[PDB]
Amino acid sequence: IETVPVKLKPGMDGPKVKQWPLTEEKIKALVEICTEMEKEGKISKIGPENPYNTPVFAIKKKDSTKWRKLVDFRELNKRTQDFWIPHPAGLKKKKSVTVLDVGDAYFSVPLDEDFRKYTAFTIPSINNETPGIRYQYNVLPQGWKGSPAIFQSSMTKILEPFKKQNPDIVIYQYMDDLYVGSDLEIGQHRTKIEELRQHLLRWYELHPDKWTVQPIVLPEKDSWTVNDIQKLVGKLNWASQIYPGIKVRQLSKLLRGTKALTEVIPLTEEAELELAENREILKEPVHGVYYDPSKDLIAEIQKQGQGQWTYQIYQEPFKNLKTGKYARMRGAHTNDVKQLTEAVQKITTESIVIWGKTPKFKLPIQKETWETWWTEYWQATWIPEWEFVNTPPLVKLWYQ
Amino acid sequence: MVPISPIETVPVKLKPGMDGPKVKQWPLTEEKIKALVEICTEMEKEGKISKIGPENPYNTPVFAIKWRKLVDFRELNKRTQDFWEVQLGIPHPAGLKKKKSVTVLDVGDAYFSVPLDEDFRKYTAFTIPSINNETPGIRYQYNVLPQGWKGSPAIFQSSMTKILEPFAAQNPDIVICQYMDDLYVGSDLEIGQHRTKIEELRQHLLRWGLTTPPFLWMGYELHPDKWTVQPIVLPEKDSWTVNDIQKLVGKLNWASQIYPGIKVRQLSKLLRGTKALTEVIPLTEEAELELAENREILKEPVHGVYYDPSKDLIAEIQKQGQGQWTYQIYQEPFKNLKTGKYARMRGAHTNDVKQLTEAVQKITTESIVIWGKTPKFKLPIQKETWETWWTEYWQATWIPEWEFVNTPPLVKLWYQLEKEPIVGAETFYVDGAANRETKLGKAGYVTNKGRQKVVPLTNTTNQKTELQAIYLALQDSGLEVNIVTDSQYALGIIQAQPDKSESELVNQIIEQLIKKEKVYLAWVPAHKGIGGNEQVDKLV
Ligand SMILES: Cc1cc(/C=C/C#N)cc(C)c1Nc1nc(Nc2ccc(C#N)cc2)nc(OCCCN2CCOCC2)n1
């Protein structure tokens, strides 16, 4: 009921980010939504005295045909002091984790008047005709990094009964999302959540236990071709960049001479021992792999084709904190970019559950291609950072 | 007197830590001074400006060019804040709709009638030097938006929109615009009902105290039924300066939005890493024909139509050649809304598919800006070609809804690397080494059939010989062939699948691959003593 003082960082002005073009239907959906949001005092039209701007678009979520207003507060977020919960390391260990959209609750809290100028955004017009309808936020804006940190106080007071009623249920909050974990049974889990939905009214289901950190494996054949062994050695050589005592000399010895690629080379005892010793090494985890929360998390995605995608999360090269594999079919068999986007969401969501912050992605896609279409399949309320890799990584065939 | 609604002022501040302007008052002739005194008198009579005293330490210079008053806010603008864009980016004619009638109204009577924020008028203080400097010059400040000030256009058009807003949502059968001293309204209504609603507008502006084809607009010509560009003037001269090239290039790109087949590569090739205004630059035979073709294109006028939301939107792309593409956008055959082109990005290697994709993404972006939707595409590429490409492409890639059009040249795939090693195909282990300091090196291969070759090379590098050895392996082999290499560089290039390259070496590799039936291309790590893969034959 009282605006907490909010200011920017030393030597930084508010966000002046260009609004990218929106389609006709998304513009209508934003017009309809903002028209009402204005009436509820959530937003108020601003004049030309406000120079700042944060991009804004519209999406559609699961089991919902109603549009949602997405504001890309990425530039405004990195221009906020923040520093106002130690990440619950038990969330990634629960049988089931549920994700809830507690964004509506933020709109009951007024915003610091001096800061409202930085929450400026523009609903664009088609063909640069009329000037874009401009708004600023009066309440707490969804997606803003300062939104949950401020509401962190109010939220602790809301979930005070539920937590103490059952201290076996873990609860976490990142951006507009509330994450709830439980080792219970799904039927009782959904009702326990149904109980938590009515508990929130008066004031997507994951399974982290169905996931680990994928290892590196080598083939088990009875007869090996030259090409089979050439790949094997190639993988082992790459695996040596990570694991210590990986030796390839006894297998390389088999390749001596200049045989045909499809010719079968029988394994020697010296080599069979070496391959076996290499397996044992790969079985063990990676040595001295820790997580420094001061550094950036990097995600690398490799398109494997046939709906399959591989990824890795790390901070220092050859020191993965996690590696995974996807192949889901959410009615996207004809579209690579939709798959990539759903994959980026998935990874980012998982990244939130484990470390409590999103990673920086390296996407196997042209900047121009991605930038045109990704919003058309985005269904998350947060947005990570991303680079674009243009050189075909050899490591693709080493993670499959 | 009917009470005029007061236009709410937009609060203006300076930049943080900056004091207002304080420049010297420019010495004027007695003629210029006598002129300004009359103007500033009748302006003060019109309620535009007002007289002030010595309490205002801020000074703004003022000139007089012949009659007309000029105020130089060159230093105040350096001290005035930033405003919202409003609206950096003009509407494109191809997006507008056909209107049966368009009326013109005057807004020169209304510009000066827009108040300025009170606590900012003290920065607009200017001095009129009296005769012979024998008196303290007349001090004055503005009470409305000055012409030339940093924030005037933004506040003007903002307050203007705010006024027209009710008389626009209540009249969906009407369309308005602001350019520049005038106001333009259009409708498809009867000439009677149209002239009526214009009177309803003049009376709506009268409330705030405002009683005031073909059209030349932003380089376009706007007709009630169609649009085009204002005639493009290409400077004809035997001597071509660097500045005249950019003038020629800029005017050609402008014309390419409606004139189909416009090419601009050969003229843009002559602006690489050169920053000058004076240099008589020659032209190739490819450039002279190009400019002669453009003059042949611009010899007959062509018109674009307007957008009717009731119909499909369609974009058609054709390969011009040499990394150049052209597109036409329409709803009905032969009736373009607009045209345009796409030039390939500055790279070393590329293929037609990747370029076609880029053009589509450009058009798509351009389309959404103008019509707010994605168009259907007619593309010079067989579905299979696209089907093979994107499924196998290491990258993620996508093209919106589209259909194939059989208008050659067709975009195709010229070769496809095997997924698995080929049975019965000879296996060429290749390497290529080069001495860094002597620029000398070797490149060659050995095969499972005893076949060998090492070729000696002068003036070359490691990355060049590793390519070369593959070129040799390609050269001396059957229609089917496996190739092992240790060059992550050589593989990295071919796994990007170019059909054209800057390096002629690569181009020759490409030509070789094309002539082949099946090509498998394996990779191994070097110096791990991998047999077949010999370093001892090339390193020497
Ligand atoms: C009137 C006008 C005059 C000039 C310059 C004149 C000079 N000097 C410049 C502009 C830019 C406009 N403004 C305008 N003009 C048209 N049609 C039109 C027809 C014939 C002629 C002629 N001859 C000229 C114009 N249509 C529209 O918009 C319609 C679509 C609206 N929606 C809104 C929601 O999103 C979708 C688009 N705006």
Chain breaks in chain B (C to N over 2.5 A) after: 66, 212
Chain B residues with CB-CB distance to A305 below 8 A: 391-392
CB contact under 8 A, A396 and B161: no
What part of A 290-319 touches B (C-beta under 8 Å)?
Answer: 303, 305
Backbone φ and ψ for A174, nearest 5 degrees, come out as -130, 120
**Any ligand 1 atom below 6 A from CB of B303:** no
Helix (H) or strand (E) holding B139: strand B138-142
As a dihedral over the C-alpha atoms of residue B142, residue B144, residue B149, residue B150, rounded to 10 degrees, the angle is 130
Query: How far does B167 lie from chain A, in Å, by closest CA?
Result: 14
Give the list of residues 6+ apart from residue A352 with CB closer than 8 angstroms, or none. A174, A177, A179, A358, A382
Annotate B384-446 with DSSP letters as a single string. Answer: HHHHHHHHH-SSB----SEEE---SSPB-----B-SSPPTTS-EEEEEEEE-TTT-EEEEEEE
Q: Which amino acid is at A129?
A: E
Looking at residue B308, the DSSP 8-state letter turns out to be -
Q: Between chains, do B394 and A364 touch, taking CB under 8 Å as contact?
A: yes
Q: B333 exposed, middle or buried (CB, 10 Å; 0-12, 13-18, 19+)?
A: exposed
In this structure, the strands spanning A360-363 and A298-305 are parallel
Angle at B396 between CA B394 and CA B401, to 5 degrees: 130
Kindly provide the residue ranges of all beta strands, DSSP E only, lying in chain A, ordered along the sequence. Answer: 43-45, 56-60, 67-71, 96-101, 121-123, 133-137, 170-174, 177-182, 205-206, 224-225, 264-265, 298-305, 308-314, 320-326, 360-363, 385-388
Amino acid occupying residue B173: D
Cβ of B224 closer than 6 Å to ligand 1, yes or no, is: yes
**Integer angstrom CA distances of residue A290 from A243, A319, A323:** 16, 9, 15
C-alpha B96 – ligand 1 centre gap (Å): 5
Report which ligand 1 atom has the smallest distance to the Cα of B216: 8
Residue B7, H or E segment: none
* B351, B319 contact by CB (below 8 A): no
Tokens of B246: 């950019």
**Could you tell me how many residues make up chain B?**
540
Restricting to A residues 186-215, those with a Cβ less than 8 Å away from any Cβ of B are none
- The 8-class DSSP code of residue A92 comes to G
Q: What is the 3-state composition of chain A as percent helix, strand, coil, each rounded to the nearest 5?
A: 35, 20, 45
Q: Is the dihedral of CA A217, A222, A227, A229 positive or negative?
A: positive
Four-CA torsion A390, A395, B389, B320, nearest 10 degrees? 20
Confirm or reject: Cβ of A2 under 6 Å from ligand 1.
no
Residues on chain A touching B372 (C-beta within 8 angstroms) = 21-24, 27, 126-127
What is the spatial distance between Cα B367 and Cα B375, in angstroms, rounded to a whole number?
Answer: 7
Closest to B483 (Cα-Cα) out of A261, A236, A237, A238: A261
Local structure of residue B215 (DSSP, 8 states): E
What one-character DSSP code corresponds to residue A73?
Answer: T
Is the Cα dihedral A261, A267, A268, A273 positive or negative? positive
Encoded tokens for A391: 């050189």
Burial class (CB in 10 A: 0-12, 13-18, 19+), B272: exposed
Q: Which amino acid is at A314?
A: Y
Alpha helices in B121-182 (DSSP H): 152-164, 166-169
Q: Is B70 helix (H, G, I), strand (E, B) or coil?
A: strand
Q: Identify any residues that bridge with B403 across adjacent strands, giving them in sequence order.
A: B378
**CA–CA dist B512, B515 (Å, integer):** 5
Tokens representing residue A118 in the block: 């930085």
Contact B304, B310 (CB under 8 A): no
Cα–Cα–Cα angle for B450, B452, B455, rounded to 5 degrees: 175
Retrieve residue B43's tokens: 């302006």
Q: How far is A374 from chain B (nearest CA, A)?
A: 11
Q: And the tokens for B155? A: 């506040």
Q: Report the first-to-last Cα separation within chain B, whole angstroms.
A: 103
Structure tokens at A132: 């874009």
CA dihedral B373, B379, B384, B389 (to 10 degrees): -70
* Interface contact flag, B427 A258, Cβ < 8 Å: yes
By CB neighbour count within 10 A (0-12 exposed, 13-18 middle, 19+ buried), where does B78 fall? exposed
DSSP-assigned beta bridge partners for residue A121: A135
For chain B, count helices (H), then strands (E).
Answer: 13, 23
User: Does residue B177 line the site of ligand 1, with CB under 6 A?
Assistant: yes
Residue B250 Cβ inside 6 Å of ligand 1? The answer reads no
User: Phi and psi for B498 in degrees, rounded to 5?
Assistant: -85, 155
B233-245 CB burial, b ≥16 within 10 A, e <16 = eeeeeeebbbebb
- State which approach was used to obtain the coordinates: X-ray
Helix (H) / strand (E) containing B186 = strand B182-187
Q: Which protein residue has the closest C-alpha to ligand 1 atom 35?
A: A126
CB burial string A106-124: b at 16+ within 10 A, e below: bbebbbbeebbebbbbbbb
What is the SS3 string spanning B354-381?
HHHHHHHHHHHHHHHHHCCCCCEEEECE
User: B277 vs chain A: nearest CA distance in angstroms?
Assistant: 33
Contact B369 A128 (CB under 8 A): yes
Residues 6+ apart with CB under 8 A from B351: B497, B498, B499, B500
Nearest CA residue ID for atom 12, ligand 1: B177
- Does residue B393's CB lie within 6 angstroms of at least one atom of ligand 1? no
From the list B486, B509, B493, B472, the residue with the least C-alpha distance to B348 is B493
The whole-angstrom distance between B258's CA and the closest CA on chain A is: 17
Long-range contacts of B227-231, Cβ-Cβ distance < 8 Å, separation of 24 or more: B227/B93, B227/B94, B227/B96, B227/B258, B227/B303, B227/B304, B227/B305, B227/B306, B228/B258, B228/B301, B228/B302, B228/B303, B228/B304, B229/B254, B229/B255, B229/B257, B229/B258
Query: Distance between CA atoms of A176 and A155, rounded to whole angstroms?
Result: 12
Flag whether A176 is marked binding. Answer: yes
Q: Inter-axis angle of helices B383-392 and B352-370, to 10 degrees?
A: 100
Residues found in chain A:
400
* Angstrom distance (rounded) from CA A91 to CA A170: 6
- Interface check for A3 against chain B (CB to CB < 8 A): the answer is no
Q: Residue B420: which of B496, B480, B486 has the closest Cα?
A: B480
- Which element (helix H / strand E) includes A52? none
Q: At what angle do helices B462-475 and B504-515 cross, to 10 degrees?
A: 20
Q: Give a three-class secondary structure readout of A190-250.
A: HHHHHHHHHHHHCCCEECHHHCCCCCCCCCCCCCEEHHHHHHHHHHHHHHCCCCCCCCCHH
Largest CA distance in chain A: 81
Residue of B395, B449, B519 to mutate for A, most A C-beta atoms under 10 A: B395
Q: How far apart are CA A379 and CA A377, in angstroms?
A: 6
Please name the residues in contact with A279: beta carbons below 8 A apart, sequence gap of 6 or more: A218
| Torsion over CA: A206, A212, A213, A218 (sign) | negative
Residues B341, B347, B351, CA angle at the centre, nearest 5°? 70
For strands B376-379 and B402-404, give the pairing.
parallel
Residue B97 Cβ < 6 Å to ligand 1? yes
Strand B518-523, strand B452-458: pairing? unpaired
Q: How far apart are CA A360 and CA A312, in angstroms?
A: 11
> Closest chain A residue to B85 measured between Cα atoms?
A51
Q: How far apart are the first and last CA of chain A?
A: 55
Residue B188 among known ligand-binding residues: no
Tokens representing B497? 């699948």
How far is Cα B129 from Cα B135, in angstroms, rounded to an integer? 8
| Nearby residues of A219 by Cβ (< 8 Å), 6 or more positions away | A228, A232
Q: Does residue B168's CB lie within 6 angstroms of at least one atom of ligand 1?
A: no
Block residue for tokens 């985890």: A285
Cα A14 from Cα A113, distance rounded (Å): 14
The answer to whether the Cβ–Cβ distance between A131 and B158 falls below 8 Å is yes
Cβ neighbours of B10 in A, within 8 Å: 47-49
Which residue type does B55 have?
A: E
H or E element that contains B483: strand B480-485
Spell out which residues of chain B touch residue A38, defining contact as CB-CB under 8 Å.
Answer: none
Q: Are B267 and B235 in contact (CB under 8 A)?
A: no
Instruction: Find, among A263, A273, A264, the residue nearest to A223 by Cα.
Output: A264
